[PDB]
Design a protein around this ligand. Structure first.
Ligand SMILES: CCCCCCCCCCCCCCCCCC(=O)OC[C@H](COP(=O)(O)OCCN)OC(=O)CCCCCCCCCCCCCCCCC
Ligand SMILES: *[C@@H]1O[C@H](CO)[C@@H](O[C@@H]2O[C@H](CO)[C@@H](O[C@@H]3O[C@H](CO)[C@@H](O)[C@H](O)[C@@H]3O)[C@H](O)[C@H]2NC(C)=O)[C@H](O)[C@H]1NC(C)=O
Lengths: 48, 49, 48, 49
């Protein structure tokens, strides 16, 4: 789901790559913990 | 919230006032593509009846 | 050439702790959590 | 012959159950003859008798 308007709902995860064994998980538009989104933010990433 | 009489010829509780809707699970409902079916398809409940 | 006395000291320091470590922890790490009556290893979501 | 491996079913994931149609054949619902494969073919091609 390539954007935020799509990434709503539930999706199935699959455990150890086995297609017969699945669990529903809600899907959310996650944002990275280190990002380049304002300059202060960019600097923290560079420091890491 | 429908009222669900119990029935024979269906061995389950059922409502004769409207039609249910099944959305599959990985499909989100509320998507414009899905929201627009539940709009136009809502005229079937009169022909169903 | 100057570094030779160091690299001979690093080798005799790995050989002590390879021997000591072996004696202390040999054969210990062969009992992971498993689901009852199954061969699936039971871990939490981001745990190895 | 059904073979399921108990050593590889983790207990709480719920695999698919079934979707196949129940296609039993006339020569498998009853003991087969040669004088019934004549009857069976003769009423697949829409004849009376
Ligand atoms: C020493 C004191 C350093 C204080 C660092 C600091 O307060 O950084 C907070 C700021 C957070 O920015 P961000 O990564 O977007 O996180 C958002 C949630 N606070 O992250 C920053 O502003 C990063 C600033 C630190 C930059 C490190 C490299 C230069 C270090 C100079 C000293
Ligand atoms: C799909 O959903 C739309 C939105 O609910 C439905 O359109 C609505 O249809 C009803 C009846 O056709 C409209 O009611 C009418 O309202 C006008 C005043 O706007 C009034 O003069 C009429 O006498 C009647 O009360 C309703 O307004 C209309 N909504 C909009 C925004 O136009 C549509 O019917 C649904 N489609 C199907 C197939 O059910």
């Amino acid at each position: 789901k390539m954007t935020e308007e799509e990434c709503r709902g539930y999706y199935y995860v699959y455990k150890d790559g086995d297609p017969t064994q699945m669990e529903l998980r809600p899907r959310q538009w996650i944002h990275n913990d280190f990002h380049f989104d304002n300059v202060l933010s960019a600097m923290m990433s560079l420091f890491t | 919230k429908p009222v669900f009489i119990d029935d024979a010829n269906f061995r389950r509780q059922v409502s004769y006032q409207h039609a249910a809707v099944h959305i599959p699970t990985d499909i989100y409902e509320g998507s414009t593509i899905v929201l627009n079916e539940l709009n136009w398809t809502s005229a079937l409940d009169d022909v169903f009846k | 050439l100057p570094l030779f006395h160091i690299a001979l000291l690093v080798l005799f320091m790995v050989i002590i702790y390879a021997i000591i470590g072996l004696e202390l922890f040999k054969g210990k790490m062969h009992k992971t959590c498993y689901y009852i009556g199954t061969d699936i290893v039971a871990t939490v979501e981001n745990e190895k | 012959i059904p073979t399921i491996n108990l050593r590889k079913r983790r207990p709480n994931v719920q695999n698919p159950k079934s979707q196949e149609p129940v296609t039993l054949d006339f020569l498998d619902a009853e003991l087969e003859n040669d004088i019934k494969v004549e009857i069976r073919n003769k009423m697949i091609d829409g004849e009376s008798g």
